[PDB]
């Protein structure tokens, strides 16, 4: 086969193989065979050896198997260089800018531009040959970036096969995480006790820089594209505006908004119409980008040491302000995690007066070394949630006090317990955990109670009919369930579930009362070994370790809950209502 051809199949093979390793270990909806699949992974290795030149530590081969095809974070120089824009913060600049362009002119100044939102994300490069996606790397330093093609496949919008494009195409855009996701990812991290991201750029970086591409897919990652590299001239594009439309038609996703505008003045118009939607977008945007619209006049205009001249970045005012951290108070979540809250000196960020800010968890406070008396620079993560961006250390009077959790839980009085990287309340009955408790217990994985809708649980909790798990069985009085959208067509029905659930066995019962670590499997492995709550309640450290997957750390934990009077109490009241305490 002609050296040229070999390249193509090599380009294609590696793709189909990345696509299907994805279509498999990721999506779980493979099309081809798990065997006919290796019938390609082999041929890839056949051409790679009879044309050694094409070997690339990117190829599926370099690390094959029946494992998730990972992305080699190997450094890669991009076909063309990727630049950064210069920053303007006032209309004077951007006037001056368009003025700088006047150096040439042609009976004007009002210059047609294309203005678009500034996607707070990470620049990515996507090289394509004959249309096929060869690789996709991060911006890195503008010249060499990390290879991360696999992860770029977890984003369904990034196209793999173009059509009618230049033999060599280098399309550039960005990959980002929407505030909802950003915020979601940040919530799951606080609970685990990890340090949370301070913004959508970083949070997008990591979510893409994961060995296991299966992870990048659960993160929200979205990508948009706005520029070409090797290919401008090839494409026949003339206007920036057309570019974005061309880019769209080809299968590339272009989601950040854009529009035309004439002369600084006009640009300055879109700017504000934008600055007003600065928090109305499904993603954080810290400014906009003024791009001269005539691509033809891009060449004459050059790039400085590290920036273009035909384009510019007009950024929104930076919302950052210094203030002091005065006191810090604690709260307890629905899971038990005792959260930290910093009470700052009343300050201002966009008119909204900030006075109470989340610490996060103990990690954040530790990482940023956030003491008390400390002066802190507070910002808005994602431009939506204020948080101490960093402490102004040098200004430390040296008399600041270190943040320490309290001995007890402020919402029930029970002594606290450090279950991992975050402090929490072991109390089985702490009022702060009722809703979560009642629900977990009601899940099909638990004592399966389909009637208890998330709304009824908080309705039964607010109206005082319930307080904990046992109370469910004393709701017998349907007279009780007949005042919250239920009649007796609806009552009697649920009433029998709170009954039938009495019969789920000790296994499922142990899982319902959420013990420290006792997972669905750790629970069953617990019921089998004790037959009854009574027995278990008399379990010993040793007896507990001896169990499959019960480690010393969790053993000594379960051991303390079990002895807790509250737990005892809750259990008794459940037995005394007919809930079976034996293995089913
Ligand atoms: N829509 C866009 N068009 C061109 N470049 C962008 C766009 N969005 C982000 N960038 C790049 O990403 C960086 C974001 O900067 P910002 O955050 O202050 C800039 O240096 C830009 O070069
Ligand atoms: Zn508590």
Swiss-Prot record:
InterPro entries found in the cross-reference section: BRCT_dom (IPR001357), BRCT_dom_sf (IPR036420), DisA/LigA_HHH (IPR041663), DNA_ligase (IPR001679), DNA_ligase_AS (IPR018239), DNA_ligase_CS (IPR033136), DNAligase_adenylation (IPR013839), DNAligase_N (IPR013840)
Amino acids binding Zn(2+): 409, 412, 425, 430
Residues annotated for NAD(+) binding in this entry: 34-38, 84-85, 116-119, 139, 174, 226, 291, 315
Catalyzed reaction equations: NAD(+) + (deoxyribonucleotide)n-3'-hydroxyl + 5'-phospho-(deoxyribonucleotide)m = (deoxyribonucleotide)n+m + AMP + beta-nicotinamide D-nucleotide
Entry cofactors: Mg(2+)
Enzyme Commission number(s) from the entry: 6.5.1.2
A single Gene Ontology CC term: cytosol
Taxonomy, superkingdom: Bacteria
GO biological process terms, semicolon-separated: DNA repair; DNA replication
Keyword annotations from UniProtKB, A to Z: DNA damage, DNA repair, DNA replication, Ligase, Magnesium, Metal-binding, NAD, Zinc
Function text: DNA ligase that catalyzes the formation of phosphodiester linkages between 5'-phosphoryl and 3'-hydroxyl groups in double-stranded DNA using NAD as a coenzyme and as the energy source for the reaction. It is essential for DNA replication and repair of damaged DNA.
The protein's name in its UniProt record: DNA ligase
Organism this protein belongs to: Thermus filiformis
Gene expressing this chain: ligA
């Amino acid at each position: 086969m002609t050296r040229e051809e070999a390249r193509r199949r090599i380009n294609e093979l590696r793709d189909l193989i990345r696509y299907h390793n994805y279509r498999y270990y990721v999506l779980a909806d493979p099309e081809i065979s798990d065997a006919e699949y290796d019938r390609l992974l082999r041929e890839l290795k056949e051409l790679e050896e009879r044309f050694p030149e094409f070997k690339s530590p990117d190829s599926p081969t370099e690390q094959v198997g029946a494992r998730p095809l990972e992305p080699t974070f190997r450094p890669v120089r991009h076909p063309t260089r990727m630049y950064s824009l210069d920053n303007a913060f006032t209309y004077e600049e951007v006037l001056a800018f368009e003025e700088r362009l006047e150096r040439a002119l042609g009976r004007k100044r009002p210059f047609l531009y294309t203005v678009e939102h500034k996607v707070d994300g990470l620049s990515v490069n996507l090289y394509y040959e004959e249309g096929v996606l060869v690789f996709g790397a991060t911006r890195g330093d503008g010249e060499v970036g990390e290879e991360v093609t696999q992860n770029l496949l977890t984003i369904p919008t990034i196209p793999r096969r173009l059509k009618g494009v230049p033999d060599r195409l280098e399309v550039r855009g960005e990959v980002y995480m929407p505030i909802e996701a950003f915020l979601r990812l940040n919530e799951e991290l606080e609970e685990r006790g990890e340090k949370v991201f301070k913004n959508p750029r970083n949070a997008a970086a990591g979510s893409l820089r994961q060995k296991d591409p299966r992870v990048t897919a659960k993160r929200g990652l979205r990508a948009t594209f706005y520029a070409l590299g090797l290919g401008l001239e090839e494409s026949g594009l003339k206007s920036q505006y057309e570019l974005l439309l061309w880019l769209k038609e080809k299968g590339f996703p272009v989601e950040h908004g854009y529009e035309k505008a004439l002369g600084a003045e006009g640009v300055e118009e879109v700017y504000r119409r934008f600055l007003a939607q600065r928090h109305a977008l499904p993603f954080e945007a810290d400014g906009v980008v003024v791009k001269l619209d005539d691509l033809a006049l891009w060449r004459e205009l050059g790039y400085t040491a590290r920036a273009p001249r035909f384009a510019l970045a007009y950024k929104f005012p930076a919302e950052e302000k210094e203030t002091r951290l005065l006191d810090v108070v604690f709260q307890v979540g629905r899971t038990g995690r005792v959260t930290p809250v910093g009470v700052l000196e009343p300050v201002f960020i966009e008119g909204s007066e900030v006075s109470r800010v989340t610490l996060h968890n103990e990690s954040y406070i530790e990482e940023l070394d956030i003491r008390i008396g400390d002066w802190v620079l507070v910002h808005k993560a994602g431009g939506v949630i204020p948080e101490v961006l960093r402490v102004l250390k040098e200004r430390r009077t040296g008399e600041e006090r270190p943040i320490r959790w309290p001995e007890t839980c402020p919402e029930c009085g029970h002594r606290l317990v450090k279950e991992g990287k975050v402090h929490r309340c072991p109390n089985p009955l702490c009022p702060a955990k009722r809703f979560e408790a009642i629900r977990h217990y009601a899940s099909r994985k638990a004592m399966d109670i389909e009637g208890l809708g998330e709304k009824l649980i908080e309705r039964l909790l607010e109206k005082g009919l319930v307080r904990d798990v046992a109370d469910l069985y004393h709701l017998r009085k349907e007279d009780l369930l007949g005042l919250e959208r239920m009649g007796e067509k609806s009552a009697q029905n649920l009433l029998r579930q709170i009954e039938e659930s009495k019969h789920r066995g000790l296994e499922r019962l142990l899982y319902a009362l959420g013990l420290p670590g006792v997972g669905e499997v750790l629970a069953r492995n617990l019921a089998r070994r004790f037959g009854t709550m009574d027995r278990l309640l008399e379990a010993s450290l040793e007896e507990l370790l001896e169990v499959e997957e019960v480690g010393e750390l969790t053993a000594r934990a379960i051991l303390e809950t079990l002895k807790d009077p509250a737990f005892r109490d809750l259990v008794r009241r459940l037995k005394e209502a007919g809930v079976s305490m034996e293995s089913k």
